[PDB]
Amino acid sequence: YDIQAWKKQCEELLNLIFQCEDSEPFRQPVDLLEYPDYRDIIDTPMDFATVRETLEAGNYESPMELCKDVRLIFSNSKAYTPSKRSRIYSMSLRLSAFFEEHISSVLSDYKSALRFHKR
Ligand SMILES: Cc1nc2ccccc2n1CCC(N)=O
Numbered sequence: 001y002d003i004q005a006w007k008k009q010c011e012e013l014l015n016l017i018f019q020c021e022d023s024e025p026f027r028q029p030v031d032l033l034e035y036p037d038y039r040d041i042i043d044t045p046m047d048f049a050t051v052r053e054t055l056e057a058g059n060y061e062s063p064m065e066l067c068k069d070v071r072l073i074f075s076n077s078k079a080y081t082p083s084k085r086s087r088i089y090s091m092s093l094r095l096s097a098f099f100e101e102h103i104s105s106v107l108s109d110y111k112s113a114l115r116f117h118k119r
Helices: 006-019 021-026 048-056 063-080 087-117
Strands: none
Touching (some): 006 048
16 A cells, blocks of 8 residues: 555666667657658657656656556557568567556556555
8 A cells, every 4th residue: 555666666667678678769769860750750759768767856646657658658659660560669569568567566556555545
């Protein structure tokens, strides 16, 4: 029932994500010199360094907000990919599966703790 436990749990999951080779295309903002039309397709860029910095600044109130930004990294990759078989998009799908598998208990524990707080 610890309402604050999600933050360190998210920090540890982000550390695992940064160790994953599949996260390399998503660690830093997409470079416009490499992908000149990126901002014609993607309105809201997101990357794992931005998520980590937002968490560390104390700018997430809940793990749901962090989850929304991580999911935006994956939806941006899906929207930008020229093919559903592209290398970077394929890496995004594996990384998304790994993230969803691990974030599930973080979200459940937070929501349960909050329900207990408001009982
Ligand atoms: C984030 C992303 N998703 C893509 C899907 C397909 C092709 C490129 C893609 N990028 C950019 C890779 C980078 N510039 O770091």
